């Protein structure tokens, strides 16, 4: 599962190349989600004489 993005900072209107002073967006980590399957059981019996 990925996360949202993002915020980008707008320029200072005078800095048109060398250098542009825009945001550095950090490559969003893909987050694992893991699922665990638990078990249960029941037993029963009767005897053929009862």
């Amino acid at each position: 599962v990925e996360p949202d993005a993002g915020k980008a900072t707008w320029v200072a209107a005078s800095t048109y190349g060398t250098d542009t002073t825009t945001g550095e967006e950090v490559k969003g980590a893909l987050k694992e989600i893991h699922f665990s399957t638990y078990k249960l059981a029941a037993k029963s019996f009767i005897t053929d004489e009862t």
């Binding site: 048109y16 190349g17 060398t18 250098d19 542009t20």
Partner: protein, 49 residues
């Protein structure tokens, strides 16, 4: 005598990658001027006061 030697004429070249919202032009040649013997140029003075 006074001859100027050259081995590349004026050339013109340009980029774009790895720029950043810019295109840019370069011009580069190779040349010099040489006094062959000793003399044959004279000027001044024509000093100051």
């Amino acid at each position: 005598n006074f001859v100027m030697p050259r081995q590349r004429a004026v050339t013109v070249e340009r980029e774009r990658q790895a720029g950043k919202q810019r295109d840019a032009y370069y011009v580069t040649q190779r040349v010099n001027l040489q006094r062959y013997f000793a003399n044959g140029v004279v000027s001044g003075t024509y000093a100051a006061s």
